[PDB]
Amino acid sequence: WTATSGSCKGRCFELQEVGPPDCRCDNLCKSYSSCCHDFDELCLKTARGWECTKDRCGEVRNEENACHCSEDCLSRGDCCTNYQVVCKGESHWVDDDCEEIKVPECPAGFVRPPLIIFSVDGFRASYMKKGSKVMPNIEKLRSCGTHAPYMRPVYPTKTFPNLYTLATGLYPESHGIVGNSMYDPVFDASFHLRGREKFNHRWWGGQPLWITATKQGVRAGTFFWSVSIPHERRILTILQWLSLPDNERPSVYAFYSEQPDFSGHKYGPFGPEMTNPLREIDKTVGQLMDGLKQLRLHRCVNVIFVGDHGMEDVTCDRTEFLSNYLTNVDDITLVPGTLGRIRAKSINNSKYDPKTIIAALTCKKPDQHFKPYMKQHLPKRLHYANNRRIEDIHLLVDRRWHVARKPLDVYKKCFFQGDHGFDNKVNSMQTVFVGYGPTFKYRTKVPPFENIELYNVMCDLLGLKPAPNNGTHGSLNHLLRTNTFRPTMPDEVSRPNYPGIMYLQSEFDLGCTCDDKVENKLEELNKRLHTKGSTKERHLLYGRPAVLYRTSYDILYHTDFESGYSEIFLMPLWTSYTISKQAEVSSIPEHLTNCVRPDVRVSPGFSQNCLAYKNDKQMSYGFLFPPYLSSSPEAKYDAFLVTNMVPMYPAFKRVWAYFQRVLVKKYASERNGVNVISGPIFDYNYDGLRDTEDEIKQYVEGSSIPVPTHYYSIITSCLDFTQPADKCDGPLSVSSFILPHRPDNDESCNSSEDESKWVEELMKMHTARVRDIEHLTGLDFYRKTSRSYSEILTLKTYLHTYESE
Ligand SMILES: *[C@@H]1O[C@H](CO)[C@@H](O[C@@H]2O[C@H](CO)[C@@H](O[C@@H]3O[C@H](CO[C@H]4O[C@H](CO)[C@@H](O)[C@H](O[C@H]5O[C@H](CO)[C@@H](O)[C@H](O)[C@@H]5O[C@H]5O[C@H](CO)[C@@H](O)[C@H](O)[C@@H]5O)[C@@H]4O)[C@@H](O)[C@H](O[C@H]4O[C@H](CO)[C@@H](O)[C@H](O)[C@@H]4O[C@H]4O[C@H](CO)[C@@H](O)[C@H](O)[C@@H]4O)[C@@H]3O)[C@H](O)[C@H]2NC(C)=O)[C@H](O)[C@H]1NC(C)=O
């Protein structure tokens, strides 16, 4: 209840929200229904429009007007944005030449350059090229400042999750806004676009930029604009705030446009009707810049022009209906559209079985335009699992499609030609980034990056310490002229042991056989030196990974590969090797087929055993260093050491064998050699983070050999591919993956065919950043390069997306 008979005179767009039942004059008052009676009269003035004209110049201030053309407007900071253009012979900002901004050029009293965040809903990355003729203010920002070709949103590629990610540097699973619509079973409440529950603060976790600012003494304008405030009024209000005195003036501001999303849904991303919404947004940018220029702030302020997500062509007829798959369709609730989330319509229905749902949704139609997942089996790059608001069953929808429960839902609600929400690597979902100001670089193009990284940079631009977040602080230093953040590499927590030969063969009772009884001092010293680390500079190109947690492990050297062997997990944390462009593939000889050899540096008690695998009828084993790529027949015996073995389901061995026997050599031919680091990942609680011993849910039968949930590989070469991977002078090139370790290939509908028709497509789906693998393993890679650490941080956040340009 609001007592809406107090006043808004001299309080219009107050920055301090006052508690009801005092009447509010701030941005959320409309969205609460609590504005003072005169809010619209005093704070939403529109008389005479938004532009000066020749006749208005020098007018007598008249306070009914929307903005002013009187002589005193500048020192009041409430001129129409085109006042000096119309009345004082000045040029529009867009008509002025680009001039480098080397230092903030700010009025006295500014303690730091302000930041303005200009966010644009549904501004797809390709609009920067395709709409350039109709967006000259935006093109100037882009060409004069720092820009990326595109920015990667988070999943799902919806508005709230993305804007809230921008604000917090957090994945949706950690900030809590995991969708535009949500059910939280702990609160037993629902969050929707429509309605009031979304305003409750228990939905919104982490710490958003405006709180981070406030807690550190930096004031903020509003981030949420009521839909009934026109864009011109948002701009004027920001300009007004910027005219405030030092002790009251915010240092961070946000503008938000509903366009071009709003049109894009009606007309498709490139509908002919889209030209006008792009013109209008551009005009709004020009208003701001002319406005800043009048106030002498246009070479003082940092401006970020950023979108939340793009827009794809989607129509009614490209809908999949769960009712075509499931007989039980009324026993489930679906969150529908460009993704799907399924839970039971009622939790008193004990008949509901997720596994049978999954099975009924799996590879049933030959061109099925969605794929069902248990949420822990989703590509780890999505980071979309560790929140009780994300339902266990998820449907990843093909680009251009929708999923719905029943046909009645899609014709009792065709209306739309555009939607978004799909997998965040889809080109159509990509969005924009331009930074313009003194703190940003001048006419600089930077590579694509993820929006989770911006919170850190915004904090850097404002002199704030970021709250803990999923950004990699430093990885965007190359966007910035100054205020870079210079991190140190984390400190190694466990130092390795380097065991020599300590055990005799007969001390091992493993159930393991190897037909290796096949007997000189030229190559006896040669092999001892391989075991003491003589080829290590070849196979460990970027130093050994640092183990960032407390554990017990051994460095094991070999001719063809080096490993960090865990005595706790009984396998390598990592195995590292280099495959030159000229390496040859050889087959596994028959004397070695089911050969596994004891490793005489590692006790029987810290080794795997073959008998466990023989007993375990579901689980087989593979190798981390692939025997197919051994350098010589004498070296191939090393690949069969028990310390190179890892548990693998036979269904996953098909994938693994193809990667090892075919793809690694293909990559080495394409990239002029590759270095490979492979290993296991254990993420049984799907938090994106390395499990401890006590989190492991599955062991090889009758043993303490833990079963990985995933296998990773990091494939590094020279960005200049005329240099070989092992002799690279400059910047590196990387691709990686995190392959789910699954007992079937249900995920791949074409898996009954030969591996050349499906394995690579699976691997691309599970592409990863090095940084994802770091979180998952507690390892820190690229410790010893000749590159700057920020450049390495950028490499570690790179994601190879396998989309065309
Ligand atoms: C992305 O970056 C983020 C931020 O860096 C990373 O997330 C962090 O991960 C940390 C490690 O998991 C985690 O640390 C835990 O914090 C617990 C205290 O948490 C509260 O306070 C913090 C600080 O202000 C706040 O951030 C939290 O907010 C969460 O919770 C509410 C909802 O409940 C949400 O609104 C909010 O969005 C956020 O939710 C997210 O986090 C929680 C987990 O905290 C998830 O469940 C949600 O799904 C969502 O993802 C909280 O308000 C603290 O209690 C934990 O400590 C336990 O473990 C240690 C082990 O050493 C032990 O010493 C402690 O005693 C404690 O154990 C006891 O409790 C156990 C569980 O109940 C019990 O089993 C034991 O028996 C023990 O008695 C822990 O330190 C940190 O909270 C989050 N922060 C955020 C914002 O998410 C994230 O990991 C990064 N992602 C990747 C892939 O890198």
Ligand SMILES: Cn1c(C(=O)N2CCC23COC3)cnc1COc1cc(Cl)c(C#N)cc1C(C)(C)C
């Ligand atoms: C999205 N929006 C809405 C919105 O949707 N309105 C008004 C009517 C409805 C439709 O449904 C309700 C209003 N104003 C915004 C901008 O929000 C932001 C912008 C930015 Cl730049 C950042 C950042 N960084 C963060 C936000 C949040 C505050 C979302 C977190």
Ligand SMILES: [Ca+2]
């Ligand atoms: Ca949006």
Ligand SMILES: [Ca+2]
């Ligand atoms: Ca985990």
Ligand SMILES: [K+]
């Ligand atoms: K077996």
Ligand code: NA
């Ligand atoms: Na299959």
Ligand SMILES: [Zn+2]
């Ligand atoms: Zn939209």
